[PDB]
């Protein structure tokens, strides 16, 4: 392994820096044999992923905070994380030397960085793009004779998504799905961008949209590539659009469309939007008969914030509709612009990232995912002047990247927690302030998480019936991982 | 190999407020942490510091400004400094090594008293 070079910039905490010819490195997980128990430490003063072990105590008389473990619970299963890939990230990376090109695709995928699984592709001319550009423009064409791929398609995507596939050891799924229509097809021309096709289900209009999916598809799938799923449409609401349109659409053309197709294994899921409308938009499409043999889960937001109830809508869902899975399409920053677009090593945003997929996890959800990959100094190229922040930036001139700690927090979840384990379930004995979930391994293993949000250090023990007791302590604004091996 | 270090874990026993020095006897291929314990009558064992080969020295709340622990990578040599009758407190203290998969060799201890 090698060190890291660390630089800073004025603010709370310190970022690293690598130049062609150097980088960090990490070694594989290690299961030490019975009796002990490893641990890996994280923190602001500077230490990065410290592994540390010792011994397991076979009889402890001392009292304080207790976490009761009982593997006699099984809740839900896990499915994997990923990221989100667009043409501002494949146009700001591929301008850099071949070696900084190597290095930035064996730091997201191979085995000496954290693992990932899942890639999003959208549609066609997301926000962040130079210009505006359709698959089909040609005028009062019903059947689709025209349609024709673009420059950027097939020379900044294709390669890039074809080299990832090389330098990994774990499944890579694939996702997909639209922004909005060709502009002779809408109907009347509301408001721009987004607008609204005017008429009934069943018309020409309807049925000339809905063999956007399959040609789109069949076109894609000509350099071995094949997908896992669909959605139905983004941001759904134009803010100002009823529950009672989307019902008889889903039920009447579309479906039936893509089984008869020669694709009839991908799934189709339902909403791509906030949850504070969630125990009332269900209610209308579900209880109708005809539109419930299509849909196969739900997609929800998040906002990074937790004001709203999450027991009032979230958790109460899942009483009324079982067997229908949930998962989470993307961790939409709320990118309220007010403050500086990019601030450069800052510790306080790092712990939103965490305590979002520690809450998400214990009501039900399986899944995460996130918006973008690398962006310049100042913000992504966007064409209605909006700017947000990602965990790794990028400056030509001076050929350099540099990392982020929302890097370590990502990390700490992705890395140690494989597809298809289960949560068995922890009882604590006190009030606390600490937060912790635990999980088992496929193979019989066991992994748990602790994070603090404090300036106290606290003592804490935990007690397993088959191997015996552990004690430790607990420092202020750090994080935890502790692995051990049952018999 | 999975493990290739056998027992040892000789421990010199220096006698009052001086420096004891803990060190390792016999073949070792890599080493990971080793440090101190420390285990009182009608209680369980305590960690009082330890350091990682390559890395940094914790040190426990109730002791911490008191002692001072000092290493040598050369012989395998960790020498723990003893300030003169500073510790009114006594026990009987142990040394620990997860030398090496990896498995923990305790060894046995000394014992020392310091009464008013």
């Known amino acids: 392994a090698r060190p890291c070079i660390p630089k800073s910039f004025g603010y709370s905490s310190v970022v690293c820096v690598c130049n062609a010819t150097y980088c960090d490195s990490f070694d594989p997980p290690t299961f030490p044999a019975l009796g002990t128990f490893s641990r890996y430490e994280s923190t602001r003063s500077g230490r990065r992923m410290e592994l540390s072990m010792g011994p397991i105590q076979a009889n402890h008389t001392g009292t304080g905070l207790l976490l009761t473990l009982q593997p006699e619970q099984k809740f839900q299963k896990v499915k994997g994380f990923g990221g989100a890939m667009t043409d501002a990230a494949a146009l700001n990376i591929l301008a850099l030397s071949p070696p900084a090109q190597n290095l930035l695709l064996k730091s997201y995928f191979s085995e000496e960085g954290i693992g990932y699984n899942i890639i999003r592709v959208p549609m066609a001319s997301c926000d962040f793009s130079i210009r505006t550009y359709t698959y089909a423009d040609t005028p009062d064409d019903f059947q689709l004779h025209n349609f024709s791929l673009p420059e950027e398609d097939t020379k900044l995507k294709i390669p890039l998504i074809h080299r990832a596939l090389q330098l990994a050891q774990r499944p890579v799924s694939l996702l997909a799905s639209p922004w909005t229509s060709p502009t002779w097809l809408k109907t009347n021309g509301a408001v721009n961008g987004k607008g609204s096709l005017k008429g009934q289900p069943g018309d020409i209009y309807h049925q000339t949209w809905a063999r956007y999916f399959v040609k789109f598809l069949d076109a894609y799938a000509e350099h071995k590539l094949q997908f896992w799923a669909v959605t139905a449409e983004n941001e759904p609401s134009a803010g100002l659009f009823t529950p009672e349109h989307q019902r008889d659409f889903i039920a009447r053309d579309l479906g039936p469309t893509l089984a008869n197709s020669t694709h009839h294994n991908v799934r189709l899921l339902m909403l791509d939007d906030q949850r504070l409308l969630l125990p009332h938009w269900a209610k209308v499409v579900l209880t109708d008969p005809e539109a419930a043999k299509y849909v196969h889960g739900i997609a929800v937001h998040w906002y990074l914030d937790f004001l709203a109830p999450a027991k009032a809508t979230l958790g109460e869902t899942h009483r009324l509709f079982p067997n229908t899975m949930l998962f989470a399409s993307e961790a939409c920053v709320g990118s309220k612009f007010w403050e500086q677009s990019v601030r450069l090593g800052s510790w306080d945003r790092g712990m939103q990232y965490s305590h979002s997929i520690i809450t998400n996890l214990l009501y039900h959800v399986v899944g995460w995912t996130d918006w973008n990959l690398a962006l310049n100094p100042e913000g992504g190229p966007n064409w209605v002047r909006n700017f947000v922040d990602s965990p790794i930036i990028v400056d030509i001139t001076k050929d350099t990247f540099y990392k982020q700690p929302m890097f370590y927090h990502l990390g700490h979840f992705s890395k140690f927690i494989p597809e298809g384990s289960q949560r068995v379930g922890l009882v604590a004995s006190q009030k606390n302030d600490l937060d912790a979930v635990a999980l088992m391994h496929p193979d019989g293993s066991a992994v748990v998480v602790v994070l603090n949000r404090s300036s106290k250090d606290v003592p804490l023990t935990i007690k397993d019936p088959a191997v015996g007791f552990l004690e430790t302590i607990s420092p202020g604004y750090s994080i935890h991982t502790y692995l051990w091996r049952r018999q | 190999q999975v493990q290739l270090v056998e027992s040892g874990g000789g421990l010199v026993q220096p006698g009052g407020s001086l420096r004891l020095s803990c060190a390792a006897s016999g073949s070792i291929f890599s080493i990971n942490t080793m440090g101190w314990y420390r285990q009182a009558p009608g209680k369980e064992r305590e960690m009082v510091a330890y350091?990682?080969?390559?890395?940094?020295?914790n040190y426990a709340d109730s002791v911490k400004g008191r002692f001072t622990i000092s290493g040598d990578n050369a012989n395998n040599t960790m020498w723990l400094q003893m300030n003169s009758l500073k510790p009114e407190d006594t026990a009987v203290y142990y040394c620990?090594?997860?030398?090496?998969?990896?498995?923990?060799?305790w060894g046995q201890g000394t014992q020392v008293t310091v009464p008013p």
């Open positions: 350091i990682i080969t390559f890395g940094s020295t």
């Open positions: 620990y090594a997860a030398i090496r998969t990896y498995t923990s060799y």
